[PDB]
């Protein structure tokens, strides 16, 4: 039964190491969510600092890949940072070679191709991570593209990842079934973040303080993460209506 140890086919045509890499993805017990506005793309992720000895400012699963591209990761931090460093290198090299900023979907495809190689080549293991890339692309506008250990990737109107992804997914599905549009019809990113947080609260059935969340926002020509005080302002606005 060595077909379960390396990335070769089982008699059922399955790759067990890929399947087990998907399971490692939920090891952090963190849920993430991404949604698109008119002018922006917002990504929120649960932040859990279980040890009081930790410096909470260094605990993060959101990465600034390039000026325009942000990336949230679902999975262990070592594999997350592995993917982060590579994505940064790929995005920089792309700009140097081709003279323009690497698009979010193109980066996602590139990282997906790398992941695919790990599922075919035996000496390389899959990374136990799911990568959600976000940006406001200059051609496609607000963009969410997600990659997994199988080397699969696709664009999203909105998406959720983690142990409780299904609850969040269904919650988001139901909202877009009502609105009948592919995005959050809102001008300011502040309100799109408020929407994202509100719907995560509804789906998970939990309240959040400023330190329980982590937020990334993509606008035209820049991606940035919010501070705890920026998130607090967001939480106050949610509570006041």
């Amino acid at each position: 039964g060595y077909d379960r140890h390396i990335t070769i086919f089982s008699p059922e045509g399955r790759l067990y190491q890929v399947e087990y890499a998907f399971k490692a993805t939920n090891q952090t017990n963190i849920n993430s969510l991404a949604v698109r506005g008119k002018d922006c793309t917002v990504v929120i992720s649960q932040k859990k600092v279980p040890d009081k000895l930790l410096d909470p400012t260094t605990v993060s699963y959101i990465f600034c890949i390039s000026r325009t591209i942000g990336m949230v990761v679902n999975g262990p931090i070592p594999d997350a940072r592995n993917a982060a460093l590579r994505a940064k290198a790929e995005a920089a090299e792309f700009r140097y070679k081709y003279g323009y900023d690497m698009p979010c979907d193109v980066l996602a495809k590139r990282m997906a191709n790398l992941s695919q190689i790990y599922t075919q080549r035996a000496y390389m293991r899959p990374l136990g991570v799911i990568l959600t890339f976000v940006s406001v692309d200059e051609e496609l506008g607000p963009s969410i593209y997600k990659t997994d250990p199988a080397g699969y990737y696709v664009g999203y109107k909105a998406t959720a990842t983690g142990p409780k992804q299904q609850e969040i997914t269904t919650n988001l599905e139901n909202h877009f079934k009502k609105s009948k549009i592919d995005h959050i019809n809102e001008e300011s990113w502040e309100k799109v973040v408020e929407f994202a947080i509100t719907h995560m609260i509804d789906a998970l059935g939990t309240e959040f303080s400023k330190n329980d969340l982590e937020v990334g926002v993509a606008t035209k020509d820049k991606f940035f993460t919010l501070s705890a005080e920026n998130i607090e302002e967001r939480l106050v606005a949610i509570a006041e209506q």
């Binding site: 379960r4 190491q17 399971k23 930790l54 410096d55 260094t58 931090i77 070592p78 940072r81 390389m124």
Partner: protein
């Protein structure tokens, strides 16, 4: 089964058992700690005196990287040295290209990526050490702890080795009782106490205390070993607290 026989193999849980077995080697090692103070960091380690024939103060465990970073580890000592050698290469190449000494977060990732690389293949074994390291850069003091998996975070206080639970509890008290912060000289004293307290898990043999520190005011942001009078003062303070 057989998932634990090879590195980089995911078990049906999604676990890398070989990395988890490396942690066992770390847990078997001596206690080492790190304390982040107001303008720097303090490192301390328990050195078990296996025999009277060991020359005192000679078998130095804490290692310097560049001139501003200190590194201490628990577990397989040779693995720790190998990691520091890499760290020194990383720091040298960074300074060569960018002129400025490597920032502590930058350095942390260099170690992190290297250790993580040793969980990607079955042709290598994971590191049998947890490394506590840090120092002072342009943005101030930083303390890190790095595990066999390649996982690392920033810390207010850190501990690893056989007496880590004891040490952690002591560190947690300091964090609660000093929200404003701890001075470098206080941190040296507290580091001595915590190692002495953590020595209860290794009470069979006696030990030698080794402390180092980087502080903006006390050492000009350079890594230095605590020696002579300042070391004896910390040993006295520690001995007073256990009695």
């Amino acid at each position: 089964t057989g998932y634990d026989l090879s590195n980089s193999v995911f078990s049906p849980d999604g676990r890398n058992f070989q990395v988890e077995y490396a942690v066992k080697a770390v847990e078997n090692g001596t206690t080492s700690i790190g304390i982040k103070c107001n303008d720097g960091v303090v490192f301390a380690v328990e050195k078990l005196i296996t025999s009277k024939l060991l020359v005192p103060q000679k078998n130095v465990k804490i290692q310097v990287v560049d001139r501003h970073i200190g590194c201490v580890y628990s577990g397989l000592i040779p693995d720790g040295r190998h990691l520091v050698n890499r760290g020194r290469e990383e720091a040298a190449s960074f300074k060569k290209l960018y002129k400025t000494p490597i920032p502590i977060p930058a350095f942390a990732d260099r170690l992190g990526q290297y250790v993580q690389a040793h969980t990607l293949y079955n042709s290598v074994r994971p590191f049998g050490v947890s490394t506590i390291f840090g120092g002072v850069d342009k943005n101030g003091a930083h303390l890190y702890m790095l595990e066999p998996s390649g996982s690392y975070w920033g810390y207010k206080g850190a501990a690893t080795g056989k007496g880590r639970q004891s040490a952690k509890a002591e560190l947690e008290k300091l964090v609660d009782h000093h929200p404003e912060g701890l001075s470098a000289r206080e941190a040296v004293k507290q580091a001595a106490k915590i190692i002495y307290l953590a020595h209860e898990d290794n009470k069979e043999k006696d030990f030698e205390l080794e402390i180092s520190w980087c502080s903006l005011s006390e050492t000009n942001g350079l890594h230095k070993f605590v020696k002579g009078d300042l070391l004896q003062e910390a040993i006295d303070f520690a001995q007073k607290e256990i009695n």
